Design a protein around this nucleic acid. Sequence first.
RNA 1: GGACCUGGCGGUGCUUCAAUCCCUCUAGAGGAGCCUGUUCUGUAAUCGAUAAACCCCGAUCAACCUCACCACCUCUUGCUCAGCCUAUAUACCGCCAUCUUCAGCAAACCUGAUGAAGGCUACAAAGUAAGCGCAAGUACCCACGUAAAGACGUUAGGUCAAGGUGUAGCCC
RNA 2: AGUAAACUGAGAGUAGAGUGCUUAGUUGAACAGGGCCCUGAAGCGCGUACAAAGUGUACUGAGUGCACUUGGAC
Lengths: 135, 220, 109, 132, 303
Amino acid sequence: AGSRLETVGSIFSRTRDLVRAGVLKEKPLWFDVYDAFPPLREPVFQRPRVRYGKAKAPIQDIWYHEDRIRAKFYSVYGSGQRAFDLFNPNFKSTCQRFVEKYTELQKLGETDEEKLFVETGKALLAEGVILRRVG
Amino acid sequence: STDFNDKILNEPLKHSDFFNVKELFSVRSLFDARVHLGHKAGCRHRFMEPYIFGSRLDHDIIDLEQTATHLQLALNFTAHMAYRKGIILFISRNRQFSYLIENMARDCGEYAHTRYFRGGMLTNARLLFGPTVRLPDLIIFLHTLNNIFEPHVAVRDAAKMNIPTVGIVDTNCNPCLITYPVPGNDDSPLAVHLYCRLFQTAITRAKEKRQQVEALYRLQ
Amino acid sequence: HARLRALNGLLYKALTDLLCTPEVSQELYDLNVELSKVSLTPDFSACRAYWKTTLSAEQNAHMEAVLQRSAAHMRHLLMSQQTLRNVPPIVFVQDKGNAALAELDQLLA
Amino acid sequence: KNRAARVRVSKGDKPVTYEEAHAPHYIAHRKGWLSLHTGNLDGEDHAAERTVEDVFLRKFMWGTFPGCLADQLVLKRRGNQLEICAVVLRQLSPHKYYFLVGYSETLLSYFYKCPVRLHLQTVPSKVVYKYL
Amino acid sequence: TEDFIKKQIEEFNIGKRHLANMMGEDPETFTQEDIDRAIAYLFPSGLFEKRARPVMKHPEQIFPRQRAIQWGEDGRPFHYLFYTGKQSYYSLMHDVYGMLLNLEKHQIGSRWLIKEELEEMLVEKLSDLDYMQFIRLLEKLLTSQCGAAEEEFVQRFRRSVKQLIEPVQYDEQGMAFSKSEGKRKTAKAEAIVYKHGSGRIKVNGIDYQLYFPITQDREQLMFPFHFVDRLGKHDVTCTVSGGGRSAQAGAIRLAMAKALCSFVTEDEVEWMRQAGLLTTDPRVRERKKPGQEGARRKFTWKK
RNA sequence: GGACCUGGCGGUGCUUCAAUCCCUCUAGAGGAGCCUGUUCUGUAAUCGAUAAACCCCGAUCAACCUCACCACCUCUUGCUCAGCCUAUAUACCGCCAUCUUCAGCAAACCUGAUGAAGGCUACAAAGUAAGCGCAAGUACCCACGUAAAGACGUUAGGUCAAGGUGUAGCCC
RNA sequence: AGUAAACUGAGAGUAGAGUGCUUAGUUGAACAGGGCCCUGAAGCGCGUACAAAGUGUACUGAGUGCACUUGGAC
Ligand SMILES: [Mg+2]
């Protein structure tokens, strides 16, 4: 007997309204659970609309200050050979090591960007990193 | 019987998490399972914007905080239905995971329908099955998109019949009609296995707690 | 009908000119198709271009496939050239009448 | 199209019994004979008289039990006896049933010069074999 | 329902005891076959269809399983794949998939059962494409180095696809021989072929050449013995009756071939059977049909 | 007047086709006689059937009868609680023909933002469909073939002269 | 395909009456591969219609000339 108008209100709304009307003889099994623990959003039907004007998708891109260092390192040395073991969550690559050394070098007090980059390369070379150059 | 029904059914509703589902997963575990990897930004569906954390190189990232909250709610609701002995039906048309979903359903006792969905299996359930057939009290859409990247007809049919639907909605899904959406990744085998394990554990815990409480009531 | 006969002659000449070049396609041109005749349906609903078949069966099949694939492009080329203001759909039909003469002469030899 | 001894399809609201639902060609395969005697057997005689007796008895019973017979009447001719078996509705009073049974028995027996028995089986309603 | 079926079971047991008492047979040892015989006798029916006749069986065999409701008293379906609508079919598909996974991890005699056979096996209504899917999965299971543990399961879906040597009897004088029979059209022939003989072939007490004044019939008689190269090595007595001359010749030929089987080696018998000597002819005259002159001759089409 | 939806039509071509459209195999009809049916003439003097789907057909069959026709004569409550072979098959029942040498007919249910309307994709995407029919089953000699079956509709198809019957009319 | 063809019996009905009908049996083959004008059945589809077109302009007597539009097809 439940109303089959899925485009009008939610399942909870329709069931509650029909019960209040008395058309529904008794509340269905899940009604009490839904009432006790409603979802964050009422499952009301809603037709998607395509943005037309200057309105934009509010999804912001993801970046970090270290993305600059990563991009420059990739440009100067490429991907090298330390292939990404994406399964290890604690995995750190050569680019990650360069980023860390760049960050600590900046924290030292040195502020020039190009000097930070070159000195980071030299410091990792001293550490033993094979910073093979792409070109 | 009134005392029985009260003390059994209504007691769990008192506590926010009677089945202690929150311990079944952690944001770290979801991240390891890759629940947070969505489709490309171009494939994004407008209504998933609130759940999308952001875009990384034109790849959507699902906000695992929102996913954790939604999964808490969905697992809690599923456990409550299992405890109330409702019929839970797992639906998904991903042939890659059809076998896993069927086995998980068999193991947890609840039912599954992963094959082709004949028209009206819910709307015309009485004629397709019989007048006395009992319809599912809860549905779980492990995949809400049919093989043609369209919302599974079961979603709309469940909305029509007023059967609550938990559903793993991807960044290109349409969560408008899913009662309990769980924004996440539906394509990673690790993510799907995590979902299946979580639901199986929730159902098993709900049923065992139901049996334990029934025995406690009856012994006294 | 004299009008139909004139249309057939003009279409035969136009189609031969078309096939003389890679205009339709290099693949079609390389096949060196020869047209036996052109016949227009009495109602002007279709134009059958009878093309001579070769002995090789695979070659015949490939030529037929290419001709079927290029018929629409040839129709468009004609209607663009204005050789005929309106051209019905073009259908390519295999022609095998000369096989009887060939094999006769073979036996009679 | 064969119009012979068939119930044409309708909207599905037309209930029909076993006999009415089975067509002639099925005879001797799915449905037996409503009259069982030895007249038509090879080398026997009096087929015409057996047929006349069958027709007369059927009309007699149909007119005697208006709106009471819920199925066709099965005739058996053992030796010289006659047995008329009927399915009747439980709509007419038992006293009337018994009186009609005795009267028909005696009258047919005197008419045809042979013992006759009528056996009624009662049903709440005509036995529906399908709906057409 | 299940309670209804149990009641029918009790009623059938009581009826079985009634029948055993009526026939005087020990109810304890009273079997289904005995019940069958007794019911057949006690309710003589002349219907051609084995189904239209009466029956008194166990409710299991009697009733259609009607898929057994599928949901218990509570209303929870028994089969986890129940909501598919083809629960048994999809269960079988899942099982075959599991077996294929297991085999993948580890690593002119028959055919497949027809779709109707499979439908009866699964007590389910399938489609052509469903049958194709199942059969293709089964074929993959074959090709996947199916061992005994798997071939045993597969043979559950497989379907498998010689002339009888009559005894060599002996006469009063101890001479061996073999007797056989065969029918063609309306003719019947009984042929006795002796292990050893000078090629004499007496038909109806008459010499073969005299009885069959047609060299074609003589050739028919000669065909089997010529085929096995045993002409003049057997003496034959053939009694034929009924039908025309050609039918009689065919019947005698068939009978002689069958009788000679007993005396020729098994390979020779197989060769004869392949040739057609030993295969009974199914070609018989087709009855005239009403409204047409012949079995197929439609009357001259008027206009 | 505007925008749409469906059905109909071609004297519409290409490609598939069909004891099977034409050729291809055999046997025949038409040419002669006779048997026989029909139409026109004739007859005082027979009804119906009428392209496939009439034409040794209703008829498993006419010297009287049959017989319903013609001529003549005769009877009047009439074998019948009369009768009528007299009209009406373009009222029907009853029985059939044709496609059908088909396989579809289908009730009852369940998208177009609830318009006319629509409902297909198997690595499946809203269809399920009871029931009827084909099928299946059965007879004959198989598991074959032939029989049998052959639904809804088509031709106001036929049959009031099998019989029953609505309707029309006669009753010296 | 035991099909056609040929031949011979029997039955229904009558008092009698067929070369008619029904039915039984005997001997018993040939082609079976091509195509679609003709018939019909389909799909590919095309175009008809009921339940190329046009605007402006000018000549001629409906067409043509020039430009324009698709409110047409490829
Ligand atoms: Mg996805």
